[PDB]
Each structure stands twice: as C-alpha cells, then as structure tokens.
Amino acid sequence: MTAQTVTGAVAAAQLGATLPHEHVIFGLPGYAGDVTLGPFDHAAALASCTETARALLARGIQTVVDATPNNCGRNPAFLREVSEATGLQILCATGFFYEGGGATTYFKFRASLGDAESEIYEMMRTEVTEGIAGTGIRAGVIKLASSRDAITPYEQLFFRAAARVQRETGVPIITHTQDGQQGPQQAELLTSLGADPARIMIGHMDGNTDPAYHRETLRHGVSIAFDRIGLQGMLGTPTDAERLSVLTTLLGEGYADRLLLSHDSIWHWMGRPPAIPEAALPAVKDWHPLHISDDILPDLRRRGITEEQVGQMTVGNPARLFG
Template identity: 50%
Template sequence: MFYEEVTDGIAGTGIKPGVIKVGSSRGVITEYEQMFFRQAARIQKETGIPIMTHTQEGTMGYEQIELLVAHGADPAKIVIGHMDGTTNIRDHLRVLERGVTIGFDRFGLEGLVGTPRDEERKATLLGLLAMGYEDQIILSHDTVNYWRGRRFPESDFMMKVLEKWHVSHLFEKILPDLQQSGVSVKTLNQIFTGNPSRVFKGQPISVKPL
C-alpha cells in the first residue's frame, strides 16, 4: 500500500507524498517501529523518496540510520528530525558522521517531554556550525497549528507554556539571534534552502571524520 501511494498517489487522488515520515520512541526503536523503518528504507531504495524521522529527545538517531541503511536507504536522502532535543554534541557528531542531515526543528518548544531551552539549542547549533557542519543541518519548525475537534493548547497553562511554539518564532527570534551571534547570510541560506534542496535531489555530502 505505501509503495503505491508514493508511485501513484494517496487514496486515488493522484497526489504523491514528498517524504516518508517514520519515528521511534525515547531510547528504543520498538519492534513495531522497526517494521516501518524497514518498509520506508525499501520504498526509498525503489523510488528515491526522502525519509524524515522523528526522534524523541534526540535519542536513537544513530540507530535509526543503521536500521535504514541496512535495508537499502541512501544517507544523502535521510533527515534525522528533532535532533535539537539533545544538547550532547557527541550524539550529533555520531549521527552527522554517517552522512545524513539533521533537523533543528523544535525551537520554541521548551520544558516539555525533556526538551531543552532555546538558548541551549542555539549553543549546540552554533557549536556545530563552528565545526563546519553547515551542509548537514536543516532549520525548520515542528509545530501543531490545528487539531481537528479540540482546542490546542487545551488549557490556559499550556497556552502559556507553548506561547513560543509557533511557526513565526523561528524567523522573529531565532534567525536574528543567530545573525547577532555571527552566522552569515550565506550559511543561513545554505541551511534554509541549499540543504533541503540537496536532500530532495539526493546529492551526497563530504563526510567529516570524527
């Protein structure tokens, strides 16, 4: 079924997906989750569609790559998502060494489900950029804009906690902060446009040794 959706379109609409999304739990890829990773890798091998993953608190990124590549996926077309859920630079380097792209995509989501503060995320990002990994990082915004059938956030308390978790936060706050920290327009253009374009074209990058 999934293969036909990629090649022929979803539910008879003729509309084809741009990516495959798979995810794993905190600290483990369950047997059930592994089934979807294997299927995603096989479909990518046959169709070339990029794969984007969900990590919980930035865990299991390396293991996700190992599983995907073992079943035929191309690292040049893999984005390991939510890696800004961890500030452990070694976790990032271990993933980047495999030639994939990582997502810093949860700015504004602070203090919930183990998420770091934005200042910690920025420090980690700046460290990776200083080490020369601007060709393997994507900045985007993972946020819930509308939940059918219920209010989101569901309480005034959560509204306050999540007040920065919206699509404009990245451009109103994070982008200016990065520029003030010395990140060049050239580097930002690479992160925002060059790297996504490369992922969709499947062009490999030159992997830096650890």
C-alpha cells in the same frame, strides 16, 4: 530530483526557503472518536491555514514539508486546497507514528498474522508513486518514528519498508525521535539497509543537548533537524537558548550542509481546540511557524553565523534533500 508536492512536481531550484517539518493540520490518534464535540470546521480551518501560509510567503518561505503521519489526521486534499489558494508549496508524507503514540496495532495485528512489512511497503510505494486514497495526490516524503528506548521490532517493519521504497524511487525520508534518543540508531539502521544518506533527515535532534550525540548521528552521512524550535522546556524539550548553543557549536565544526531548522508547529488542531493551562503558556509562546524567520535566523546572524550558512540550512539543504 523534482520534489513531489500536493499540487505536483516542482524542480529542486523552485523549492526556495523551506520549513522541513511542520503540521498544517494534526490530530493525536483518537481525535476522530471525539467527533461529536470536536467536529472539523472546514471553512474555519482553511481560513486559518491560508492566513498562515500567506504569512510564511511574506517572509520568503516558499515550501513547507508537512510531516503528518497517516494515522495522525493526514489530509492531502486539504493541504492541496491551502496550496492552490496561496501558492505555498506543500509536500505531504506517507508513514505511521511511534508505537507509544496510539493507533498502531491495526498493523501490529496484521504483523502477527502475516507479512506486514510487505503490506507497509506496498502502501508507501503506492502513495509515493501513484497517489493517496484515489486522489492522485502523491506523498513527497516517507515519515518514520521510533520510541525512546529502542527502535522496536514493530517500528522496524516501517524502517525496512521505507528503505526499500527509498532505494527504488529516491524519495526522501524524515523521522521522529522520542525524547532525544535513537538518532544514531535510526541513522545506522537506515544506512545499513542501503538507503541514500543524502536523502535522510533525522528529526527532533534538538531534543538532545549533548553535541557528542549529534556528531555521532552525523558520522552516518545523514542530515539532522532541530525541528521543534520554539517548543520550550515542555516535557524534556530544552529551551531555544540550549538549542542554539548546540547549533552554533555544530556550525563552527563545519556541519552547516547537514543541519536543518523547523518548528513542528500545528496550524490547526483536529478534535477540540487545545486548552493550554496557564503554567504551560511560556513553553508554547514561541511555538509557531514564524518564529525561525523572525527570531531565530536574526539571532544566529547576530552570533556570527554567515548569510552563506543560513542559506545552506534553509535553502541549500532542502533542495538537496527534498528536491
């Protein structure tokens, strides 16, 4: 095992309770073009993010997996600052985001002129085994993403590169699914390429409310994450009540060792600060990284989920997957 964090290798048994998909900082592609009126205040970001990390530690959370793709404001050196200041363990990612998420097209262009898969493979392999941008800070997971209606031929370059790095290094893979679709397809493709199903987490599976979809995904041996908990009724995301309805069904069916829980929260936004309109405030009220600890786990316990099941989802599963 060992997990590769931004401060170094840590044993699987030292990961503790983990949030496996969050964003310490995050910018939607294009934020860097808005630098003049949306500059990065490093001191303010560090204060805000350290405060958040201290709050998680208070709740028994010892590790966070930052899922931020390379083109979405990823900043390993900043993650390391937050980690060294607080003791919160942080894994960072290597990967690029879905083909309708912007940026792109740099590799789209390179793919049209040459062997982009091989170049993406070398990037992922270098960032996992040696480090990111000269810093010596290594990625502890590979980030993949697909579009809603298909895993596009362009997206597949990244899936094929990631599978090879996975086979060679053991590194975990976590994913983005768009609008509650393609989970079975991701699982099929990655397993078909010989990637280790005990080291794959199919993401945003809470985006779909039909348990048959989750079950099919789960036939492939992989883990699945209800990782946007708290983001409610916003652009097709279900409510947390709908999420927990599906989760308790799956727990009742013995799936606790393959379910994981997160918020997909953003602790500090790159670019201009977010301007949330009045009618959207309910959607984001509970969308912050203390919601699972304070609201969700106690609610599951009230519903009859056992301490053993909660510990499996929040501690056991991450140790196996990331550790």
